[PDB]
Design a protein around this ligand. Structure first.
Ligand SMILES: O=c1[nH]cnc2c(-c3cscn3)nccc12
Ligand SMILES: [Zn+2]
Ligand SMILES: [Zn+2]
Length: 343
């Protein structure tokens, strides 16, 4: 993977101000090809003054992550636990039982992860509805991105928790997210508010179908039951397992005060190093509409009506698409049309 490598951007305050323009910019640079990019905000930017007032914040459905498996192939089962505050969570997170092990370098922590993920199941304070951004913060506000995704809520009034609303994730050592693509193969924004880092793995969109073929071969039962079983967010595949079967991939560690952008059809997975808090939501560009149209969905779920997007940005193709005669082939290497002013 030569251009599939993950790229890091350091925008200035003037550049950082227009979110959508910056997304068109990093694509004009080829960031989209890796499926995952890191954006480091200007030093003068902060989304909240202090995180000292969130101790009484309630995580309504903490999930205990049970992992079953061997030889680089695992399945994560989520067991819902009773609601707990952030204070109670941080106590468990930093406790002797669940705290991060002592380690010399990342390669060492990543080895401990993969050696111990079926043991001592951690608790993930996942899918908490809310934001930690102060009301006045106008730059890169997860709560209000203002992308073309806004058409879903503007035309219908439909709200999809986590998709067009922000979610909070309070993690602890070994908690994790399985290989997946966003709902409707949308983009995603992820900001690590505070705490220990979040490490990520990504398969470039051009090679996504290869990860899909692999996962099918390993879990044929799941594949017969549902074409899009990776959408269940239960499949954990070791970087060694990928390397062995020639799946190209890249890794990156996100630290507190950094952003991670996932692009349409960008397969990603990762784990939390220790006690931290990340905010996340989905967004879109004109480039995404074709991905939404062609997204293979779960058949066991988030389904957005594409009719509104096709009508607005693709009126020419609306008759053909509704007839099922739209044979458009997606080029994963191409940037969004919005990047025209740069490239
Ligand atoms: O750290 C995470 N914790 C939980 N979920 C994550 C997702 C995710 C979940 S649903 C779509 N993307 N994607 C990236 C990172 C995370
Ligand atoms: Zn994701
Ligand atoms: Zn399914």
């Amino acid at each position: 993977n030569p251009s599939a490598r993950i790229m890091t951007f350091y925008p200035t305050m003037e550049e950082f101000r227009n979110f959508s323009r910056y997304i068109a910019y990093i694509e004009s640079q080829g960031a989209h090809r890796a499926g995952l990019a890191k954006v480091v905000p200007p030093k003068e930017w902060k989304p909240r003054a202090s995180y000292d007032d969130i101790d009484d914040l309630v995580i309504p459905a903490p999930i205990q992550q049970l992992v079953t498996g061997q030889s680089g192939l695992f399945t994560q089962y989520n067991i819902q636990k009773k609601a707990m505050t952030v204070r109670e969570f941080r106590k468990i997170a930093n406790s002797d039982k669940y705290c991060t092990p002592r380690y010399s370098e990342f390669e060492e922590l990543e080895r401990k992860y993969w050696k111990n993920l079926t043991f001592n199941p951690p608790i993930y304070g996942a899918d908490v509805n809310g934001t930690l951004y102060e009301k006045h913060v106008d730059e890169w506000n997860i709560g209000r991105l203002r992308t073309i995704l806004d058409l879903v809520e503007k035309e219908s009034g439909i709200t999809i928790e986590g998709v067009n609303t922000p979610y909070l994730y309070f993690g602890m050592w070994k908690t994790s997210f399985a290989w997946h693509t966003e709902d409707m193969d949308l983009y995603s924004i992820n900001y690590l508010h505070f705490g220990e880092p979040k490490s990520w793995y990504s398969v470039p969109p051009e090679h996504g179908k290869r990860l899909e073929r692999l996962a099918k071969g390993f879990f044929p039962g799941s594949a017969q039951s549902c074409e899009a079983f990776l959408r269940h967010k239960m499949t954990l595949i070791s970087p060694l397992m990928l390397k062995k079967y020639g799946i190209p991939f890249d890794k990156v560690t996100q630290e507190a005060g950094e952003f991670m952008i996932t692009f349409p059809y960008g397969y990603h997975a990762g784990f939390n190093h220790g006690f931290n808090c990340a905010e996340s939501t989905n967004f879109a560009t004109r480039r995404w509409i074709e991905y939404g149209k062609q997204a293979v969905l779960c058949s066991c779920m988030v389904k957005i009506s594409m009719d509104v997007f096709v009508r607005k940005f693709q009126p020419e193709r609306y008759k053909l698409w509704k007839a099922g005669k739209d044979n458009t082939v997606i080029d994963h290497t191409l940037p969004t049309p919005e990047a025209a002013e740069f490239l």
